[PDB]
Amino acid sequence: NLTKQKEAVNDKGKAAVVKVVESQAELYSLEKNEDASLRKLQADGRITEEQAKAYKEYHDKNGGANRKVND
Numbered sequence: 001n002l003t004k005q006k007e008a009v010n011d012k013g014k015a016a017v018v019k020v021v022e023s024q025a026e027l028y029s030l031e032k033n034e035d036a037s038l039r040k041l042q043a044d045g046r047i048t049e050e051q052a053k054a055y056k057e058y059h060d061k062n063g064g065a066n067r068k069v070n071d
């Protein structure tokens with residue numbers, strides 16, 4: 001039951017950050033055409049391990065499992 005109508009020129013923080021990681025990765029599967037994401041976007045280094053690791057914690061909770069954000 002949480003919605004957001006506000007906007008920001010650059011980013012908002014853990015929301016926009018995670019959101020760009022998820023959305024960016026989401027494509028990884030789209031483009032990539034396989035799966036995973038984090039380790040890979042990171043692999044390419046788009047998102048360093050600063051936010052990505054944070055995301056790894058967001059999804060996996062640092063589980064280390066693949067997919068994380070994709071399909």
